[PDB]
Amino acid sequence: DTVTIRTRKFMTNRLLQRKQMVIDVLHPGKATVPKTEIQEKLAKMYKTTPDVIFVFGFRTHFGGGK
RNA sequence: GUGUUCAAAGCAGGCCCGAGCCGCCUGGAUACCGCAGCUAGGAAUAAUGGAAUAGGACCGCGGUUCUAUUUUGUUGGUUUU
């Protein structure tokens, strides 16, 4: 809910042939909607079939929210 | 520098764009160096120098003499400055 992947510091990694960015998602009261959702959500942002979108990170911010 | 939610701390960090911003962006300072040395300014202070039965400055020079090598095209010879 109210997810909004905020692609901060987007890096067209040309020598690793990829889109490289920081995922920064928002929440009402429950942090960290699941990773493969975020893949599928970052899929439809970029239309890139998200099983090539290999995400990680995803630590839950205190107070839900982000 | 830096909101680690304060803090112990870290070296961080911050954005806009919907997510084509295909990115933009701060940064990660400065302080310390036993000595000995080095460096170069000082020359007080503390030591420190000389002319004494004369020495120091002036090409004062003098006469002697050693020898060093440039030119005499060159070398060789000697000769000198």
PDB file of all heavy atoms in Angstrom, chain B residues 40-53:
ATOM      1  P     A B  40      68.204  26.439   3.892  1.00  0.00           P
ATOM      2  OP1   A B  40      68.343  26.315   2.419  1.00  0.00           O
ATOM      3  OP2   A B  40      69.163  25.739   4.783  1.00  0.00           O
ATOM      4  O5'   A B  40      68.235  27.985   4.276  1.00  0.00           O
ATOM      5  C5'   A B  40      67.346  28.908   3.665  1.00  0.00           C
ATOM      6  C4'   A B  40      66.425  29.531   4.681  1.00  0.00           C
ATOM      7  O4'   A B  40      65.858  28.483   5.513  1.00  0.00           O
ATOM      8  C3'   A B  40      67.074  30.470   5.683  1.00  0.00           C
ATOM      9  O3'   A B  40      67.312  31.777   5.201  1.00  0.00           O
ATOM     10  C2'   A B  40      66.106  30.413   6.850  1.00  0.00           C
ATOM     11  O2'   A B  40      64.935  31.164   6.573  1.00  0.00           O
ATOM     12  C1'   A B  40      65.735  28.938   6.844  1.00  0.00           C
ATOM     13  N9    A B  40      66.647  28.155   7.705  1.00  0.00           N
ATOM     14  C8    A B  40      67.851  27.567   7.393  1.00  0.00           C
ATOM     15  N7    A B  40      68.429  26.947   8.389  1.00  0.00           N
ATOM     16  C5    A B  40      67.552  27.153   9.437  1.00  0.00           C
ATOM     17  C6    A B  40      67.585  26.762  10.782  1.00  0.00           C
ATOM     18  N6    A B  40      68.570  26.040  11.315  1.00  0.00           N
ATOM     19  N1    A B  40      66.552  27.123  11.571  1.00  0.00           N
ATOM     20  C2    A B  40      65.565  27.844  11.032  1.00  0.00           C
ATOM     21  N3    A B  40      65.415  28.278   9.788  1.00  0.00           N
ATOM     22  C4    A B  40      66.457  27.897   9.034  1.00  0.00           C
ATOM     23  P     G B  41      68.298  32.744   6.023  1.00  0.00           P
ATOM     24  OP1   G B  41      68.832  33.773   5.095  1.00  0.00           O
ATOM     25  OP2   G B  41      69.231  31.885   6.794  1.00  0.00           O
ATOM     26  O5'   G B  41      67.344  33.470   7.068  1.00  0.00           O
ATOM     27  C5'   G B  41      66.222  34.211   6.621  1.00  0.00           C
ATOM     28  C4'   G B  41      65.400  34.732   7.769  1.00  0.00           C
ATOM     29  O4'   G B  41      64.600  33.665   8.347  1.00  0.00           O
ATOM     30  C3'   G B  41      66.167  35.278   8.959  1.00  0.00           C
ATOM     31  O3'   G B  41      66.715  36.565   8.756  1.00  0.00           O
ATOM     32  C2'   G B  41      65.116  35.224  10.052  1.00  0.00           C
ATOM     33  O2'   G B  41      64.163  36.262   9.885  1.00  0.00           O
ATOM     34  C1'   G B  41      64.442  33.895   9.734  1.00  0.00           C
ATOM     35  N9    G B  41      65.092  32.800  10.469  1.00  0.00           N
ATOM     36  C8    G B  41      65.882  31.815   9.958  1.00  0.00           C
ATOM     37  N7    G B  41      66.337  30.987  10.846  1.00  0.00           N
ATOM     38  C5    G B  41      65.820  31.466  12.030  1.00  0.00           C
ATOM     39  C6    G B  41      65.964  30.976  13.342  1.00  0.00           C
ATOM     40  O6    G B  41      66.598  29.998  13.752  1.00  0.00           O
ATOM     41  N1    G B  41      65.266  31.775  14.226  1.00  0.00           N
ATOM     42  C2    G B  41      64.538  32.887  13.918  1.00  0.00           C
ATOM     43  N2    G B  41      63.948  33.490  14.954  1.00  0.00           N
ATOM     44  N3    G B  41      64.381  33.347  12.704  1.00  0.00           N
ATOM     45  C4    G B  41      65.051  32.590  11.818  1.00  0.00           C
ATOM     46  P     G B  42      68.136  36.928   9.414  1.00  0.00           P
ATOM     47  OP1   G B  42      68.561  38.255   8.908  1.00  0.00           O
ATOM     48  OP2   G B  42      69.022  35.748   9.246  1.00  0.00           O
ATOM     49  O5'   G B  42      67.823  37.066  10.969  1.00  0.00           O
ATOM     50  C5'   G B  42      66.952  38.077  11.451  1.00  0.00           C
ATOM     51  C4'   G B  42      66.501  37.785  12.858  1.00  0.00           C
ATOM     52  O4'   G B  42      66.040  36.415  12.953  1.00  0.00           O
ATOM     53  C3'   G B  42      67.576  37.882  13.923  1.00  0.00           C
ATOM     54  O3'   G B  42      67.821  39.212  14.331  1.00  0.00           O
ATOM     55  C2'   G B  42      67.030  36.996  15.029  1.00  0.00           C
ATOM     56  O2'   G B  42      66.021  37.678  15.754  1.00  0.00           O
ATOM     57  C1'   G B  42      66.358  35.889  14.222  1.00  0.00           C
ATOM     58  N9    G B  42      67.224  34.710  14.044  1.00  0.00           N
ATOM     59  C8    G B  42      67.846  34.280  12.899  1.00  0.00           C
ATOM     60  N7    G B  42      68.537  33.186  13.077  1.00  0.00           N
ATOM     61  C5    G B  42      68.362  32.878  14.420  1.00  0.00           C
ATOM     62  C6    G B  42      68.845  31.800  15.207  1.00  0.00           C
ATOM     63  O6    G B  42      69.582  30.868  14.872  1.00  0.00           O
ATOM     64  N1    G B  42      68.411  31.881  16.523  1.00  0.00           N
ATOM     65  C2    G B  42      67.612  32.869  17.021  1.00  0.00           C
ATOM     66  N2    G B  42      67.268  32.780  18.310  1.00  0.00           N
ATOM     67  N3    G B  42      67.134  33.847  16.286  1.00  0.00           N
ATOM     68  C4    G B  42      67.553  33.807  15.018  1.00  0.00           C
ATOM     69  P     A B  43      69.163  39.952  13.860  1.00  0.00           P
ATOM     70  OP1   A B  43      68.805  41.315  13.394  1.00  0.00           O
ATOM     71  OP2   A B  43      69.886  39.025  12.953  1.00  0.00           O
ATOM     72  O5'   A B  43      70.012  40.081  15.198  1.00  0.00           O
ATOM     73  C5'   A B  43      69.369  40.083  16.468  1.00  0.00           C
ATOM     74  C4'   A B  43      69.987  39.091  17.426  1.00  0.00           C
ATOM     75  O4'   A B  43      69.790  37.737  16.927  1.00  0.00           O
ATOM     76  C3'   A B  43      71.491  39.244  17.668  1.00  0.00           C
ATOM     77  O3'   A B  43      71.780  38.951  19.032  1.00  0.00           O
ATOM     78  C2'   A B  43      72.089  38.156  16.784  1.00  0.00           C
ATOM     79  O2'   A B  43      73.363  37.690  17.178  1.00  0.00           O
ATOM     80  C1'   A B  43      71.033  37.065  16.892  1.00  0.00           C
ATOM     81  N9    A B  43      71.050  36.143  15.761  1.00  0.00           N
ATOM     82  C8    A B  43      70.692  36.377  14.460  1.00  0.00           C
ATOM     83  N7    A B  43      70.842  35.338  13.681  1.00  0.00           N
ATOM     84  C5    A B  43      71.349  34.368  14.532  1.00  0.00           C
ATOM     85  C6    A B  43      71.740  33.038  14.331  1.00  0.00           C
ATOM     86  N6    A B  43      71.658  32.422  13.151  1.00  0.00           N
ATOM     87  N1    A B  43      72.196  32.340  15.397  1.00  0.00           N
ATOM     88  C2    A B  43      72.273  32.946  16.589  1.00  0.00           C
ATOM     89  N3    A B  43      71.943  34.196  16.899  1.00  0.00           N
ATOM     90  C4    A B  43      71.484  34.850  15.817  1.00  0.00           C
ATOM     91  P     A B  44      73.061  39.602  19.747  1.00  0.00           P
ATOM     92  OP1   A B  44      73.470  40.789  18.953  1.00  0.00           O
ATOM     93  OP2   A B  44      74.030  38.509  20.012  1.00  0.00           O
ATOM     94  O5'   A B  44      72.505  40.107  21.147  1.00  0.00           O
ATOM     95  C5'   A B  44      71.656  41.239  21.224  1.00  0.00           C
ATOM     96  C4'   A B  44      70.449  40.939  22.066  1.00  0.00           C
ATOM     97  O4'   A B  44      69.527  40.114  21.316  1.00  0.00           O
ATOM     98  C3'   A B  44      70.721  40.130  23.321  1.00  0.00           C
ATOM     99  O3'   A B  44      71.196  40.920  24.395  1.00  0.00           O
ATOM    100  C2'   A B  44      69.380  39.476  23.601  1.00  0.00           C
ATOM    101  O2'   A B  44      68.509  40.382  24.252  1.00  0.00           O
ATOM    102  C1'   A B  44      68.847  39.244  22.191  1.00  0.00           C
ATOM    103  N9    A B  44      68.977  37.853  21.714  1.00  0.00           N
ATOM    104  C8    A B  44      69.613  37.449  20.573  1.00  0.00           C
ATOM    105  N7    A B  44      69.562  36.164  20.342  1.00  0.00           N
ATOM    106  C5    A B  44      68.830  35.679  21.409  1.00  0.00           C
ATOM    107  C6    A B  44      68.409  34.382  21.740  1.00  0.00           C
ATOM    108  N6    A B  44      68.713  33.306  21.026  1.00  0.00           N
ATOM    109  N1    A B  44      67.695  34.211  22.867  1.00  0.00           N
ATOM    110  C2    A B  44      67.405  35.289  23.596  1.00  0.00           C
ATOM    111  N3    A B  44      67.721  36.565  23.386  1.00  0.00           N
ATOM    112  C4    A B  44      68.449  36.702  22.263  1.00  0.00           C
ATOM    113  P     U B  45      72.531  40.491  25.173  1.00  0.00           P
ATOM    114  OP1   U B  45      72.837  41.518  26.200  1.00  0.00           O
ATOM    115  OP2   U B  45      73.547  40.123  24.157  1.00  0.00           O
ATOM    116  O5'   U B  45      72.120  39.155  25.929  1.00  0.00           O
ATOM    117  C5'   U B  45      71.081  39.148  26.893  1.00  0.00           C
ATOM    118  C4'   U B  45      70.643  37.740  27.169  1.00  0.00           C
ATOM    119  O4'   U B  45      69.954  37.221  26.003  1.00  0.00           O
ATOM    120  C3'   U B  45      71.781  36.760  27.391  1.00  0.00           C
ATOM    121  O3'   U B  45      72.299  36.790  28.704  1.00  0.00           O
ATOM    122  C2'   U B  45      71.162  35.431  26.988  1.00  0.00           C
ATOM    123  O2'   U B  45      70.332  34.932  28.024  1.00  0.00           O
ATOM    124  C1'   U B  45      70.273  35.860  25.821  1.00  0.00           C
ATOM    125  N1    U B  45      70.934  35.697  24.506  1.00  0.00           N
ATOM    126  C2    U B  45      70.818  34.465  23.927  1.00  0.00           C
ATOM    127  O2    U B  45      70.209  33.557  24.445  1.00  0.00           O
ATOM    128  N3    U B  45      71.423  34.326  22.708  1.00  0.00           N
ATOM    129  C4    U B  45      72.117  35.283  22.010  1.00  0.00           C
ATOM    130  O4    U B  45      72.609  34.991  20.921  1.00  0.00           O
ATOM    131  C5    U B  45      72.207  36.541  22.672  1.00  0.00           C
ATOM    132  C6    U B  45      71.622  36.694  23.858  1.00  0.00           C
ATOM    133  P     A B  46      73.873  37.008  28.918  1.00  0.00           P
ATOM    134  OP1   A B  46      74.096  37.619  30.252  1.00  0.00           O
ATOM    135  OP2   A B  46      74.390  37.674  27.695  1.00  0.00           O
ATOM    136  O5'   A B  46      74.458  35.531  28.930  1.00  0.00           O
ATOM    137  C5'   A B  46      73.764  34.478  29.577  1.00  0.00           C
ATOM    138  C4'   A B  46      74.311  33.146  29.147  1.00  0.00           C
ATOM    139  O4'   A B  46      73.540  32.623  28.039  1.00  0.00           O
ATOM    140  C3'   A B  46      75.731  33.180  28.622  1.00  0.00           C
ATOM    141  O3'   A B  46      76.687  33.194  29.662  1.00  0.00           O
ATOM    142  C2'   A B  46      75.798  31.944  27.740  1.00  0.00           C
ATOM    143  O2'   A B  46      75.994  30.776  28.521  1.00  0.00           O
ATOM    144  C1'   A B  46      74.385  31.907  27.163  1.00  0.00           C
ATOM    145  N9    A B  46      74.308  32.533  25.835  1.00  0.00           N
ATOM    146  C8    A B  46      73.933  33.814  25.532  1.00  0.00           C
ATOM    147  N7    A B  46      73.960  34.072  24.253  1.00  0.00           N
ATOM    148  C5    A B  46      74.374  32.879  23.685  1.00  0.00           C
ATOM    149  C6    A B  46      74.602  32.483  22.363  1.00  0.00           C
ATOM    150  N6    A B  46      74.430  33.292  21.325  1.00  0.00           N
ATOM    151  N1    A B  46      75.017  31.216  22.137  1.00  0.00           N
ATOM    152  C2    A B  46      75.190  30.396  23.182  1.00  0.00           C
ATOM    153  N3    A B  46      75.002  30.654  24.470  1.00  0.00           N
ATOM    154  C4    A B  46      74.594  31.922  24.649  1.00  0.00           C
ATOM    155  P     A B  47      78.213  33.540  29.326  1.00  0.00           P
ATOM    156  OP1   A B  47      78.825  34.182  30.517  1.00  0.00           O
ATOM    157  OP2   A B  47      78.234  34.227  28.009  1.00  0.00           O
ATOM    158  O5'   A B  47      78.880  32.112  29.130  1.00  0.00           O
ATOM    159  C5'   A B  47      80.104  31.986  28.433  1.00  0.00           C
ATOM    160  C4'   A B  47      80.066  30.834  27.467  1.00  0.00           C
ATOM    161  O4'   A B  47      78.774  30.773  26.811  1.00  0.00           O
ATOM    162  C3'   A B  47      81.053  30.919  26.320  1.00  0.00           C
ATOM    163  O3'   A B  47      82.360  30.529  26.688  1.00  0.00           O
ATOM    164  C2'   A B  47      80.419  30.021  25.276  1.00  0.00           C
ATOM    165  O2'   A B  47      80.640  28.656  25.590  1.00  0.00           O
ATOM    166  C1'   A B  47      78.935  30.329  25.481  1.00  0.00           C
ATOM    167  N9    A B  47      78.458  31.391  24.577  1.00  0.00           N
ATOM    168  C8    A B  47      77.921  32.601  24.936  1.00  0.00           C
ATOM    169  N7    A B  47      77.578  33.348  23.919  1.00  0.00           N
ATOM    170  C5    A B  47      77.914  32.578  22.816  1.00  0.00           C
ATOM    171  C6    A B  47      77.797  32.792  21.432  1.00  0.00           C
ATOM    172  N6    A B  47      77.315  33.911  20.895  1.00  0.00           N
ATOM    173  N1    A B  47      78.232  31.824  20.597  1.00  0.00           N
ATOM    174  C2    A B  47      78.741  30.706  21.119  1.00  0.00           C
ATOM    175  N3    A B  47      78.881  30.381  22.392  1.00  0.00           N
ATOM    176  C4    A B  47      78.455  31.368  23.202  1.00  0.00           C
ATOM    177  P     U B  48      83.579  31.547  26.467  1.00  0.00           P
ATOM    178  OP1   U B  48      84.798  30.947  27.063  1.00  0.00           O
ATOM    179  OP2   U B  48      83.122  32.893  26.894  1.00  0.00           O
ATOM    180  O5'   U B  48      83.765  31.582  24.889  1.00  0.00           O
ATOM    181  C5'   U B  48      84.063  30.398  24.165  1.00  0.00           C
ATOM    182  C4'   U B  48      83.828  30.599  22.694  1.00  0.00           C
ATOM    183  O4'   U B  48      82.408  30.796  22.457  1.00  0.00           O
ATOM    184  C3'   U B  48      84.469  31.842  22.104  1.00  0.00           C
ATOM    185  O3'   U B  48      85.844  31.696  21.820  1.00  0.00           O
ATOM    186  C2'   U B  48      83.604  32.111  20.886  1.00  0.00           C
ATOM    187  O2'   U B  48      83.937  31.225  19.828  1.00  0.00           O
ATOM    188  C1'   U B  48      82.221  31.732  21.416  1.00  0.00           C
ATOM    189  N1    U B  48      81.491  32.907  21.951  1.00  0.00           N
ATOM    190  C2    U B  48      80.887  33.750  21.038  1.00  0.00           C
ATOM    191  O2    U B  48      80.899  33.574  19.834  1.00  0.00           O
ATOM    192  N3    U B  48      80.228  34.819  21.586  1.00  0.00           N
ATOM    193  C4    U B  48      80.114  35.133  22.922  1.00  0.00           C
ATOM    194  O4    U B  48      79.485  36.136  23.253  1.00  0.00           O
ATOM    195  C5    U B  48      80.769  34.225  23.807  1.00  0.00           C
ATOM    196  C6    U B  48      81.408  33.172  23.302  1.00  0.00           C
ATOM    197  P     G B  49      86.885  32.758  22.425  1.00  0.00           P
ATOM    198  OP1   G B  49      87.722  32.067  23.434  1.00  0.00           O
ATOM    199  OP2   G B  49      86.117  33.975  22.788  1.00  0.00           O
ATOM    200  O5'   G B  49      87.811  33.129  21.191  1.00  0.00           O
ATOM    201  C5'   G B  49      88.041  32.188  20.158  1.00  0.00           C
ATOM    202  C4'   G B  49      87.891  32.833  18.810  1.00  0.00           C
ATOM    203  O4'   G B  49      86.503  33.173  18.587  1.00  0.00           O
ATOM    204  C3'   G B  49      88.641  34.143  18.636  1.00  0.00           C
ATOM    205  O3'   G B  49      89.988  33.944  18.252  1.00  0.00           O
ATOM    206  C2'   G B  49      87.823  34.875  17.584  1.00  0.00           C
ATOM    207  O2'   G B  49      88.165  34.429  16.280  1.00  0.00           O
ATOM    208  C1'   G B  49      86.407  34.399  17.904  1.00  0.00           C
ATOM    209  N9    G B  49      85.674  35.336  18.766  1.00  0.00           N
ATOM    210  C8    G B  49      85.282  35.100  20.057  1.00  0.00           C
ATOM    211  N7    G B  49      84.633  36.098  20.583  1.00  0.00           N
ATOM    212  C5    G B  49      84.598  37.043  19.570  1.00  0.00           C
ATOM    213  C6    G B  49      84.022  38.333  19.545  1.00  0.00           C
ATOM    214  O6    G B  49      83.420  38.917  20.453  1.00  0.00           O
ATOM    215  N1    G B  49      84.213  38.962  18.319  1.00  0.00           N
ATOM    216  C2    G B  49      84.869  38.415  17.245  1.00  0.00           C
ATOM    217  N2    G B  49      84.947  39.172  16.142  1.00  0.00           N
ATOM    218  N3    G B  49      85.405  37.209  17.253  1.00  0.00           N
ATOM    219  C4    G B  49      85.231  36.587  18.437  1.00  0.00           C
ATOM    220  P     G B  50      91.165  33.996  19.341  1.00  0.00           P
ATOM    221  OP1   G B  50      91.715  32.629  19.485  1.00  0.00           O
ATOM    222  OP2   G B  50      90.656  34.719  20.534  1.00  0.00           O
ATOM    223  O5'   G B  50      92.289  34.881  18.643  1.00  0.00           O
ATOM    224  C5'   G B  50      92.679  34.633  17.296  1.00  0.00           C
ATOM    225  C4'   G B  50      92.268  35.756  16.372  1.00  0.00           C
ATOM    226  O4'   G B  50      90.936  36.211  16.739  1.00  0.00           O
ATOM    227  C3'   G B  50      93.159  36.996  16.410  1.00  0.00           C
ATOM    228  O3'   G B  50      93.142  37.621  15.128  1.00  0.00           O
ATOM    229  C2'   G B  50      92.427  37.893  17.394  1.00  0.00           C
ATOM    230  O2'   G B  50      92.726  39.266  17.270  1.00  0.00           O
ATOM    231  C1'   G B  50      90.978  37.590  17.040  1.00  0.00           C
ATOM    232  N9    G B  50      90.035  37.870  18.117  1.00  0.00           N
ATOM    233  C8    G B  50      89.967  37.298  19.360  1.00  0.00           C
ATOM    234  N7    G B  50      88.998  37.781  20.085  1.00  0.00           N
ATOM    235  C5    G B  50      88.407  38.733  19.270  1.00  0.00           C
ATOM    236  C6    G B  50      87.311  39.596  19.505  1.00  0.00           C
ATOM    237  O6    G B  50      86.619  39.693  20.524  1.00  0.00           O
ATOM    238  N1    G B  50      87.054  40.405  18.402  1.00  0.00           N
ATOM    239  C2    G B  50      87.756  40.381  17.223  1.00  0.00           C
ATOM    240  N2    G B  50      87.357  41.235  16.271  1.00  0.00           N
ATOM    241  N3    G B  50      88.780  39.585  16.990  1.00  0.00           N
ATOM    242  C4    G B  50      89.038  38.795  18.049  1.00  0.00           C
ATOM    243  P     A B  51      94.489  37.723  14.263  1.00  0.00           P
ATOM    244  OP1   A B  51      94.178  38.399  12.980  1.00  0.00           O
ATOM    245  OP2   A B  51      95.123  36.383  14.245  1.00  0.00           O
ATOM    246  O5'   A B  51      95.423  38.680  15.124  1.00  0.00           O
ATOM    247  C5'   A B  51      96.781  38.327  15.348  1.00  0.00           C
ATOM    248  C4'   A B  51      97.567  39.449  15.971  1.00  0.00           C
ATOM    249  O4'   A B  51      97.184  40.724  15.381  1.00  0.00           O
ATOM    250  C3'   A B  51      97.379  39.607  17.484  1.00  0.00           C
ATOM    251  O3'   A B  51      98.610  39.951  18.139  1.00  0.00           O
ATOM    252  C2'   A B  51      96.421  40.787  17.579  1.00  0.00           C
ATOM    253  O2'   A B  51      96.474  41.481  18.805  1.00  0.00           O
ATOM    254  C1'   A B  51      96.913  41.637  16.419  1.00  0.00           C
ATOM    255  N9    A B  51      96.018  42.696  15.966  1.00  0.00           N
ATOM    256  C8    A B  51      94.670  42.809  16.065  1.00  0.00           C
ATOM    257  N7    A B  51      94.190  43.924  15.567  1.00  0.00           N
ATOM    258  C5    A B  51      95.321  44.603  15.143  1.00  0.00           C
ATOM    259  C6    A B  51      95.534  45.842  14.518  1.00  0.00           C
ATOM    260  N6    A B  51      94.567  46.699  14.197  1.00  0.00           N
ATOM    261  N1    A B  51      96.807  46.183  14.230  1.00  0.00           N
ATOM    262  C2    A B  51      97.785  45.339  14.562  1.00  0.00           C
ATOM    263  N3    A B  51      97.725  44.144  15.115  1.00  0.00           N
ATOM    264  C4    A B  51      96.446  43.839  15.367  1.00  0.00           C
ATOM    265  P     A B  52     100.029  40.049  17.376  1.00  0.00           P
ATOM    266  OP1   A B  52     100.110  41.359  16.691  1.00  0.00           O
ATOM    267  OP2   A B  52     100.383  38.785  16.682  1.00  0.00           O
ATOM    268  O5'   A B  52     101.064  40.153  18.571  1.00  0.00           O
ATOM    269  C5'   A B  52     101.803  39.013  18.981  1.00  0.00           C
ATOM    270  C4'   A B  52     102.167  39.091  20.437  1.00  0.00           C
ATOM    271  O4'   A B  52     101.801  40.398  20.956  1.00  0.00           O
ATOM    272  C3'   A B  52     101.474  38.066  21.334  1.00  0.00           C
ATOM    273  O3'   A B  52     102.355  37.667  22.384  1.00  0.00           O
ATOM    274  C2'   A B  52     100.319  38.872  21.922  1.00  0.00           C
ATOM    275  O2'   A B  52      99.821  38.382  23.149  1.00  0.00           O
ATOM    276  C1'   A B  52     100.967  40.239  22.082  1.00  0.00           C
ATOM    277  N9    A B  52     100.025  41.356  22.134  1.00  0.00           N
ATOM    278  C8    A B  52      98.656  41.356  22.026  1.00  0.00           C
ATOM    279  N7    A B  52      98.121  42.549  22.136  1.00  0.00           N
ATOM    280  C5    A B  52      99.215  43.377  22.336  1.00  0.00           C
ATOM    281  C6    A B  52      99.353  44.761  22.521  1.00  0.00           C
ATOM    282  N6    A B  52      98.332  45.608  22.549  1.00  0.00           N
ATOM    283  N1    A B  52     100.595  45.262  22.690  1.00  0.00           N
ATOM    284  C2    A B  52     101.640  44.429  22.675  1.00  0.00           C
ATOM    285  N3    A B  52     101.641  43.113  22.496  1.00  0.00           N
ATOM    286  C4    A B  52     100.388  42.652  22.347  1.00  0.00           C
ATOM    287  P     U B  53     103.655  36.773  22.074  1.00  0.00           P
ATOM    288  OP1   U B  53     103.516  36.125  20.745  1.00  0.00           O
ATOM    289  OP2   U B  53     103.899  35.918  23.260  1.00  0.00           O
ATOM    290  O5'   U B  53     104.827  37.845  22.024  1.00  0.00           O
ATOM    291  C5'   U B  53     104.844  38.925  22.945  1.00  0.00           C
ATOM    292  C4'   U B  53     105.830  39.987  22.539  1.00  0.00           C
ATOM    293  O4'   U B  53     107.175  39.453  22.625  1.00  0.00           O
ATOM    294  C3'   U B  53     105.746  40.487  21.110  1.00  0.00           C
ATOM    295  O3'   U B  53     104.695  41.395  20.850  1.00  0.00           O
ATOM    296  C2'   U B  53     107.131  41.085  20.901  1.00  0.00           C
ATOM    297  O2'   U B  53     107.225  42.351  21.535  1.00  0.00           O
ATOM    298  C1'   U B  53     108.004  40.092  21.669  1.00  0.00           C
ATOM    299  N1    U B  53     108.629  39.079  20.771  1.00  0.00           N
ATOM    300  C2    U B  53     109.406  38.078  21.334  1.00  0.00           C
ATOM    301  O2    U B  53     109.575  37.944  22.533  1.00  0.00           O
ATOM    302  N3    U B  53     109.963  37.194  20.440  1.00  0.00           N
ATOM    303  C4    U B  53     109.864  37.214  19.064  1.00  0.00           C
ATOM    304  O4    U B  53     110.441  36.359  18.394  1.00  0.00           O
ATOM    305  C5    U B  53     109.081  38.288  18.547  1.00  0.00           C
ATOM    306  C6    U B  53     108.523  39.154  19.393  1.00  0.00           C
TER     307        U B  53
END
